[PDB]
Amino acid sequence: QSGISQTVIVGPWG
Amino acid sequence: QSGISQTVIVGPWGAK
Amino acid sequence: GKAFDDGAFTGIREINLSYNKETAIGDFQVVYDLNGSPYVGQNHKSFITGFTPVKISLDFPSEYIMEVSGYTGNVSGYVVVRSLTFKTNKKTYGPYGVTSGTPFNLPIENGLIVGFKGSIGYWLDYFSMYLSL
Amino acid sequence: GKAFDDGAFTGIREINLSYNKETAIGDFQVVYDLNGSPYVGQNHKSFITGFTPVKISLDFPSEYIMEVSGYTGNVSGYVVVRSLTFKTNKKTYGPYGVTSGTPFNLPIENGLIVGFKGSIGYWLDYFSMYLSL
Numbered sequence: 001q002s003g004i005s006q007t008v009i010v011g012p013w014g
Numbered sequence: 015q016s017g018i019s020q021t022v023i024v025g026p027w028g029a030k
Numbered sequence: 031g032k033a034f035d036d037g038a039f040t041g042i043r044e045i046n047l048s049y050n051k052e053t054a055i056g057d058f059q060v061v062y063d064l065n066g067s068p069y070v071g072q073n074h075k076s077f078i079t080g081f082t083p084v085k086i087s088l089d090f091p092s093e094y095i096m097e098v099s100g101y102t103g104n105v106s107g108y109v110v111v112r113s114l115t116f117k118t119n120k121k122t123y124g125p126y127g128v129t130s131g132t133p134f135n136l137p138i139e140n141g142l143i144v145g146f147k148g149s150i151g152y153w154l155d156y157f158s159m160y161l162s163l
Numbered sequence: 164g165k166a167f168d169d170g171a172f173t174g175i176r177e178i179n180l181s182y183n184k185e186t187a188i189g190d191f192q193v194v195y196d197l198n199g200s201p202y203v204g205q206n207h208k209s210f211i212t213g214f215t216p217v218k219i220s221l222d223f224p225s226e227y228i229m230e231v232s233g234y235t236g237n238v239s240g241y242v243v244v245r246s247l248t249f250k251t252n253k254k255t256y257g258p259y260g261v262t263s264g265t266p267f268n269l270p271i272e273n274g275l276i277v278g279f280k281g282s283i284g285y286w287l288d289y290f291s292m293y294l295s296l
């Protein structure tokens with residue numbers, strides 16, 4: 001692990 | 015809150 | 031169509047869907063992972079027959095869906111999900127069905143599809159996906 | 164283009180963008196929420212100028228985005244987002260840009276857009292969205 005919090009990411013669009 | 019866990023949901027695709 | 035909603039799980043081990051090359055997506059069923067055991071989702075069945083089954087068996091956990099894409103459009107005057115394509119970190123499954131109408135796509139940079147819900151009549155009417163880290 | 168990534172915040176207060184009906188979406192800056200206070204995001208600017216600016220000011224926290232959609236198309240050789248529409252629980256903002264090309268949308272049943280990342284050259288090349296509960 002890292003000390004960096006994660007979050008869902010969707011995309012890209014374009 | 016309630017005691018029911020929650021989840022991100024994306025959609026719907028298809029008929030509106 | 032009849033509504034279904036599998037809920038949310040730990041992961042996806044296998045998808046079993048059926049489709050027709052002149053129409054749309056028909057049956058849909060998922061074998062999820064739940065805390066390490068395969069969780070056999072209900073088979074969501076089209077009201078009609080005549081479809082081609084496909085089994086998408088993933089090499090879980092190292093293999094996972096990175097993009098779900100497809101087309102929606104008219105079949106017999108219903109808007110339905112006319113095709114689907116599942117792309118993982120290891121390969122692409124599909125397109126299944128008919129690649130016509132309005133495209134849609136959910137690429138994921140971070141996270142996982144952990145559930146499906148939606149609605150099936152003669153064809154898959156619509157669906158949503160549950161996402162989690 | 165120049166890649167940007169705001170990372171993830173608590174919510175979205177305001178969207179500043181710009182467009183040109185001759186071309187596409189040009190600039191993009193978001194005022195986020197960060198724990199019940201405004202956090203002014205970096206302003207991601209096109210390499211060129213000429214666009215009409217738009218401020219979408221949302222009635223935060225009660226108003227939030229439920230769907231983002233758009234069109235991507237070729238502008239003078241660049242494949243770019245030519246149009247955006249933000250649909251909230253309160254109202255629709257847009258379309259801004261030219262509504263021609265391949266459509267895209269992200270509709271959300273449960274969860275919040277809590278950030279954006281993407282690339283902007285002459286125009287908005289593409290973008291992604293952090294999602295959170």
Ligand SMILES: CO[C@@H]1O[C@H](CO)[C@H](O)[C@H](O[C@@H]2O[C@H](CO)[C@@H](O)[C@H](O)[C@H]2NC(C)=O)[C@H]1O
Pocket residue numbers: 029031032077108109110150151152153154155
């Ligand atoms: C059983 O015949 C029909 O099959 C189609 C396409 O699969 C569809 O699911 C029909 O259900 C109707 O779908 C409409 C969406 O296009 C929706 O607006 C209606 O409320 C649905 N009505 C019912 C009774 O399911 C399905 O009937």
